[PDB]
Design a protein around this ligand. Structure first.
Ligand code: ZN
Ligand code: ZN
Lengths: 260, 80, 239, 80
């Protein structure tokens, strides 16, 4: 429904997953997208065209998407959100860059390719109490997932850190099927966006994709009461407070068929 | 202490039972279990049966005491 | 791998599902795509212009005609049989991304006659559902093996972008698993978007299928089958 | 006379039991079942428990005799 036009979604990372995700939401008639990325488009490493090489991914994406649907509003920022100056600007725009300026975005989507930037988004979202969806694809394209983080209500990304985040190892490490796996993940990502914003069907808190065996596990991960992120813990406190204070028409039946 | 560790991303939900000394950092248990499942250790995370996320930077003894034996590995897919 | 460049894929229907599917295979470096659809340019020509810009090294053969007419049916079969990467060889796969049962039945009829493997895809009207299906004639169920009520009863046929992208993606993934021999190819994979439920099945041929070529293919298949830890510092024990 | 018809596309695999006269075309049983499940009749198809497709243009009596009571509706999604 045209409720979709009343919502704003921020997308961080407009590479494989995010560029498809942006296209899908644009085609759905989302009120507004906010796009955040720093890389350029390259002939080396989905969505972009060759003649766009050397443009910033966010500008290139904006140029294409505006023409696909002229009624969608776009705000784009070509910067690295993990630097100290840009972090504050990032939070400002999550808080005020909604469909109506001065209101927050309805959702942030993480389509970045590294844990550092996931941790940055997580840190912002926990401070702001902003709901977000995280997405990812494995290195070998065999696997991917989406996850819904409502800070305080479901697990944040620091609640269950991967070994490298937990163990403080520096991030220090394409397959033909990468573009396809990215498309599947983007599609289930956006489907979850719509279910969430429009309140139809069941929103997944977690949905995996194992492309080898076509296995799509769902689960719902709960917040870690001892999560490293102190704003996660504070959100958990606020959530608990908030919870404590809040047919069949058969056109014809000629043949006498009986429901037993 | 003994843990039953289930791989969530395989439709057979296979599991491995690991007996470990209490003082072992649970990071080494996670790695050991990821290796047994032939999934990458570096990007694996661990949750309980209720789906409560666990920070594995603590002892096996404390993991056991706070969460019991039944734990679940999840991938943390890194590319986007 | 660069095995992908050695293959040819026919796509019938370049609307929502087929256009995404054509794009994914173009980006993958497929050797050749054959596009069939029926309506200033035609949909297949528009699709070809976009795709050629994306990857100039993919070969394209496009046909703007309705495959269900008597003349075009023979040309369709001709091109499935001879329009592979090397002219005179068949395509490696046909994909159905059409929007109607008539055209699925035509593709089915051609594939059963030729013994051509194909994948079928679809999306529901309300975007709530979709699927993909592998038809190897004689080995798995053809489309006529389990006809929908309207086909069986001889009645004339008289959020969407997201569901289409999921179905196209899982479709292509199956294509690559099939052509490149990795993972498990699904014979059937559904998608229920309301509940995120993705059931797999492997549907077998109907021995009394209305398509007599399906039956003969089943005979030939049965015959063919009848012819044959770098460290361990902490003492962790696997119990 | 009686079929247990399962909806394959719903994870709860719900089922309906339908009693029907032997002369009833099974196309009407299918329709009736699709209506009970609130899925579109026109695009539904029917398979057995072995996953063998059934042409529903035959009598309920014959469907019963050839395939028994346990049948399964599948969607045949039409758009592309
Ligand atoms: Zn947390
Ligand atoms: Zn058949």
């Amino acid at each position: 429904y045209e409720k979709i036009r009343t919502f704003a979604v921020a997308i961080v990372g407009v590479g494989g997953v995010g560029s498809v995700t942006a296209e899908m939401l644009t085609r759905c008639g989302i009120g507004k997208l906010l796009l955040f990325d720093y890389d350029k488009v390259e002939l080396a490493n989905l969505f972009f065209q060759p003649h766009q090489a050397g443009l910033s991914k966010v500008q290139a994406a904006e140029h294409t998407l505006r023409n696909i649907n002229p009624d969608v509003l776009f705000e784009v920022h070509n910067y690295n959100i993990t630097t100290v100056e840009n972090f504050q600007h990032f939070m400002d725009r999550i808080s005020n860059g909604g469909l109506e300026e001065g209101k927050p975005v309805d959702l942030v989507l993480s389509c970045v390719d590294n844990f550092e930037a996931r941790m940055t988004i997580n840190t912002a979202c926990n401070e702001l109490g902003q709901t977000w969806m995280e997405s990812g694809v494995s290195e070998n394209a065999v696997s991917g997932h989406i996850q819904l983080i409502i800070p305080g209500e479901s697990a944040c990304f620091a609640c269950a850190p991967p070994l490298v985040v937990a163990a403080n190892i520096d991030e220090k490490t394409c397959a033909a099927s990468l573009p396809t796996t990215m498309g599947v993940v983007a599609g289930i990502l956006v489907q979850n966006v719509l279910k969430f914003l429009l309140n139809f069907g069941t929103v997944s808190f977690y949905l995996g994709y194992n492309a080898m065996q076509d296995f799509f596990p769902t689960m719902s991960m709960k917040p870690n009461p001892q999560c490293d992120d102190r704003n996660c813990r504070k959100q958990q406190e606020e959530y608990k407070k908030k919870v404590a204070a809040l047919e069949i028409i058969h056109e014809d039946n000629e043949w006498g068929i009986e429901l037993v | 202490v003994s843990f039953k560790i289930t791989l969530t991303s395989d439709p057979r939900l296979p599991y491995k039972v690991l007996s470990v000394p209490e003082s072992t950092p649970f990071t080494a248990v996670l790695k050991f279990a990821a290796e047994e499942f032939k999934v990458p250790a570096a990007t694996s995370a661990i949750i309980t049966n209720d789906g409560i996320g666990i920070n594995p930077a603590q002892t096996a003894g404390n993991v056991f005491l706070k969460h019991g034996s039944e734990l679940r590995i999840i991938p943390r897919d890194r590319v986007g």
